[PDB]
């Protein structure tokens, strides 16, 4: 029964998920003056040309676009990663207002939203096993600012009417996640966690330096979703972000 409200939100999560207070929790503030350039990091390899989207679901926390991860169709490798990580889903975190919504911050700056492309280490055979390993996941984080429309996001925005409430899903085939990427693959990377319960410390975070621009109308449509199920009182799905967690004993490395 975790959520983002006064009574079940991030300040409460540690009671059911004591790892909430652990040594590698996400997200974090990225202090751009403290992050060290690591000239030994490889270019990120994003290979999404055979990505097969299945469906889009409102899970009462965000909406997830799910992919067929039964072969190496859409993979992330290189950068800080050893081996091959398979895309399983993406989702976003967003605000009630354009001045908040992102989970990661950059020199304490909050973006309007953050996209998370979730990938799992193929050496662990399935997603559920991967989340129990310290190198099990690679999450590609992309900031969203409000400006010009992102044409490659509009197919997502258009289906949100059909999944307004918790538990609603829709067919979402032939969606090309390449249309969500900025021009530059320059990134920061650090070891961290899932930013929602169960907050497992299984994530290599790769956060892109260059945000994508979306329109105010595109972000407004995210804000019209519901955390509640059909027939329950309307709670708008806004402010579904975890605030920045203590960096503790961690170095953020820059690719640039
Ligand atoms: Zn996320």
| Dihedral in degrees, nearest 10, Cα atoms 174, 44, 201, 114 | -60
- Cβ atoms of 126 and 190 within 8 Å: the answer is no
Task: Report d(CA 237, CA 50) in Å as an integer.
Answer: 31
Task: Report d(CA 115, CA 133) in Å as an integer.
Answer: 23
Angle at 121 between CA 177 and CA 105, to 5 degrees: 60
Tally: H helices and E strands in the chain: 3, 15
In angstroms, the first-to-last Cα distance of the chain is 41
* 160 CB neighbour count, 10 Å cutoff: 19
Which residues lie near ion ligand 1 (Cβ < 5 Å)? 116
Tokens found for residue 219: 């972000």
- Cβ atoms of 112 and 145 within 8 Å: the answer is yes
Task: Report d(CA 141, CA 209) in Å as an integer.
Answer: 9
**Regarding beta strands 137-146 and 203-208, do their DSSP bridges make them parallel or antiparallel, or are they unpaired?**
parallel
HSE at residue 199, side-chain half, CA atoms within 13 A, is 21
How buried is residue 212: exposed, middle or buried, by Cβ count under 10 Å (0-12/13-18/19+)? buried
Measured between alpha carbons, how far is residue 21 from residues 15, 17, 102, 228 in Å? Answer: 10, 9, 20, 28
- State yes or no: is 7 an active-site residue: no
Task: Report d(CA 52, CA 86) in Å as an integer.
Answer: 11
Q: How was this structure determined?
A: X-ray
Name which of 88, 83, 84 is nearest 70 in CA terms. Answer: 88
HSE at residue 105, side-chain half, CA atoms within 13 A, is 17
Distance 92 CA to ligand 1 centre (A): 6
Q: What contacts 30, CB < 8 A, 6 or more positions away?
A: 104, 105, 106, 107, 188, 207, 252
Task: Report d(CA 194, CA 50) in Å as an integer.
Answer: 26
Distance 33 CA to ligand 1 centre (A): 25
Name which of 102, 28, 90 is nearest 59 in CA terms. Answer: 90
Distance 115 CA to ligand 1 centre (A): 7
- Cβ atoms of 101 and 113 within 8 Å: the answer is yes
**How would you write 175-222 as a 3-class SS string?**
CCHHHHCCCCCCEEEEEECCCCCCCCCCEEEEEECCCEEECHHHHHHH
Q: Is 57 strand, coil or helix?
A: strand
Looking at 1, 7, 61, 119, which residue is catalytic?
61
């Amino acid at each position: 029964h975790w959520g983002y409200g006064k009574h079940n939100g991030p300040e409460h999560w540690h009671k059911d998920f004591p790892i909430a207070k652990g040594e590698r929790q996400s997200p974090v503030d990225i202090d751009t003056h403290t992050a060290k350039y690591d000239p030994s990091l490889k270019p990120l390899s994003v290979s999404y040309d055979q990505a097969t989207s299945l469906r889009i679901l409102n899970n009462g926390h965000a909406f997830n676009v799910e992919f067929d991860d039964s072969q190496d169709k859409a993979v992330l490798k290189g950068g800080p990663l050893d081996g091959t990580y398979r895309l399983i889903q993406f989702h976003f975190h967003w605000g009630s207002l354009d001045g908040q919504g992102s989970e990661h911050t950059v020199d304490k700056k909050k973006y309007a939203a953050e996209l998370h492309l979730v990938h799992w280490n193929t050496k662990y055979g399935d997603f559920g096993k991967a989340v129990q390993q310290p190198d099990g996941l690679a999450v590609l984080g992309i900031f969203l600012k409000v400006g010009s429309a992102k044409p490659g996001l509009q197919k997502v925005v258009d289906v949100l009417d059909s999944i307004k409430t918790k538990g609603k899903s829709a067919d979402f085939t032939n969606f090309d996640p390449r249309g969500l990427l900025p021009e530059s693959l320059d990134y920061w990377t650090y070891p961290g966690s899932l930013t929602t319960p169960p907050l497992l410390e299984c994530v290599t975070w790769i956060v892109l330096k260059e945000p994508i621009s979306v329109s105010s109308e595109q972000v407004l449509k995210f804000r019209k979703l519901n955390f509640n199920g059909e027939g329950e009182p309307e709670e708008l799905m806004v402010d579904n972000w975890r605030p920045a967690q203590p960096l503790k004993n961690r170095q953020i490395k820059a690719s640039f």
